[PDB]
Predict the structure of beta-lactamase.
Amino acid sequence: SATSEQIVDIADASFAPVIEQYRIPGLVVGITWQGQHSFYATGVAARKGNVAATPDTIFELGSISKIFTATLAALAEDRGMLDLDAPVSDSIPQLEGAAFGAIRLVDLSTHVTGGLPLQVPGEVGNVAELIRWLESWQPPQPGTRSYSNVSIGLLGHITAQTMGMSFAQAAQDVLFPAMGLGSTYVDVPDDAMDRYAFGYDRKTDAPIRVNPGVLADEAYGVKSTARDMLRLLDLELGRGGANPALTAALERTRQGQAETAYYTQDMIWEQYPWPVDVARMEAGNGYDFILSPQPATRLTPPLPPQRDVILNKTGATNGFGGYVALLPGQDLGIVVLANRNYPNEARVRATHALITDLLATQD
Amino acid sequence: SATSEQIVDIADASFAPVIEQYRIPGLVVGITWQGQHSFYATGVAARKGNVAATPDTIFELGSISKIFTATLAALAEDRGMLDLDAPVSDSIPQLEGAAFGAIRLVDLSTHVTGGLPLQVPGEVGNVAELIRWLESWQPPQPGTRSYSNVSIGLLGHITAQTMGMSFAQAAQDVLFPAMGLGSTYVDVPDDAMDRYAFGYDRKTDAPIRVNPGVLADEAYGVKSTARDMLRLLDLELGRGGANPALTAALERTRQGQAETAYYTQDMIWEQYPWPVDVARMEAGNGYDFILSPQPATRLTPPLPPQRDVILNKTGATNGFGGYVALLPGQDLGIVVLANRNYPNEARVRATHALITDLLATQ
């Protein structure tokens, strides 16, 4: 076996190239492996003040937030508050008879909607106006996976409405405490600001912050630390510590719901075999696969949570670039948080190399 | 004594030229005069479906929203919850010792702060981070009037916090009901969507909609109709039977707090003598008063609410251009709502001409 010091050494070497290539101001890697935690932290959370990045630095998760949204929906399902196999129109009755109303709730988390746009339309100013807009929407490519903030965001809206609170309240009062998190937020409070990293715009290098928007809380609203993300990954790896309802909810999100050209689509998580060629993970996380509708076939019943796979999710904002990976058969979870948005494919290549070199130590 | 029919015809004639000049898709004028509400409505609230604009069309008010923010602050003051003459640091203790903490609450509504950015900075993601940014702010032109969404927005946040609710809740559950409004919103609901106009971009003519933002609810978050805006103007005129507390709050906002080169700055309202040369109202509503700090001198104590004046406020978003004017000594209020952002001076010129023609029928 290898020391945690040797693990930190491998993380350092795996990400030195991308940090230089994309001028990443600060970067933190968390590793949980066979229940043991290691952290690599380098650079600065904030240039002004030259504040060092640490495992307790808060980063914007971007679309990694959607894992929390999906888990919240599965938690409501386990409590009998909704049925993810039911159509949207059971929750939003005015969409009865509309194509969007016929989508199963679960497919708001698989993105298998038939071509919904990535962003909330600019002519939509709140969720009520969005629902009206969806009354007349027709899927341009029925049956396809169409990666979007709109569908998963509306799943979070539906879920919070069922719980009788705002999405922020549901996440911060119910979900994050059940997960045992200590520095994860939808709304960062004053007492945590000292640790809240700034993101640095690619073109201008200016400090930039994710701003409010329609469905922003529900689709890209979470901020967290490498330390808290390892707590989540431990729960996903089945290390124990969550109540039975949360454990069931996590497991539900790791069921395989649909197959694409490159991976199995779970609830938000995207799942490859392990081992797998890195080029396939680069393609599946590739710009052109993500931005256009892609063929998908439904699994009915779903594939149970798998052992010898890698689950992953990318997440970014204008100022941040993050990545999470889960390898259940290797008892391994990795989170990589950076305060620079750098390409998905580069996050994948660097993390795949880290994983490969890490597992090679026990050869 | 002019009938509603001839008032409507005067409104029509007064705005036909500006509607053509700036290709305004829809425009509604509301007039309250001698207690009578009259409306001129023309064009469409939405080009798609040719949905007519009416006195019940909901428009984005932009900065005219700030009149509601200021009135809520004055209502909280009247209830004993706040003291508008007190420093910001009494409400936000971590700004003790900071230049921003020394600003009087009322000066968040007069804009006499010494220089703030117009918009919330991009490195600020919520009000908590905004307060942290303000800890290190220093005014670049001390004592000047600096029009800003930051200051008035923070007054709205402070007021709502003192009341123990969100600003949207304070506005929709307390203030709008107190004023008797029936179609005024910070968050437009489903049942009102059929009446919610679209705005039309100046450069692309595409429908556009105001989006969420830090302090957006507090600084530019209100949407309303001509019928409701005349109810507000009636309350400012001492009509509509407001209870004593709301009357006190409205009167507080109409006190003159500072003098600029062209007008008396009240709480958000900007006040000229009546009569007044239209060129003076054009200059005072120029974009230089938005973009650059302007000299201002404090009135201590404030000027009491005046009779022979015109109070006004411009309000816009990327898609909307609005204007309100109040003439207490003439028992007259006017609201002009449009789903095109057209220049301030044009709103002023057309409204001044409408007022002049109206009063001349006497």
